[PDB]
Amino acid sequence: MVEDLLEHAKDILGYQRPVKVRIRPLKMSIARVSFKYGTITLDPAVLNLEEEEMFYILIHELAHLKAETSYHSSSFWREVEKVFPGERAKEIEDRIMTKLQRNMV
């Protein structure tokens, strides 16, 4: 499930940290991290997305943690681009926004 996706994401990014995934209802987004505690919190709606969209969210959030930034910097996007090349991250973000009408951090 989500756990298996997360392991694949850590392997691709080369990020061996014991990041924990929590599912919690969120108001203002569908996903966010804790840098301090090494967690990714997902709104339950994420669990019903297509696999590539779920994987995007995990990669996006893991990229925040790895790049150690909340700002979507060039080094942030470099991590994302280990999976989603070129224009693909924005395409998948658009799909997720169409479906859920909510943003990830």
Spatial distance between the Cα atoms of 23 and 72, rounded to a whole number of angstroms: 23
105 marked as part of a ligand binding site? yes
8 marked as part of a ligand binding site? no
**In this structure, how many other beta carbons lie within 10 angstroms of the beta carbon of residue 39?**
16
64 marked as part of a ligand binding site? yes
Inter-residue contact 100 to 50 (CB < 8 Å): no
Find residue 20's DSSP bridge partners. 39
Inter-residue contact 2 to 17 (CB < 8 Å): no
For residue 95, give the amino acid letter. R
Annotated binding site: 60, 64, 72, 105
Annotated binding site for Zn(2+): 60, 64, 72, 105
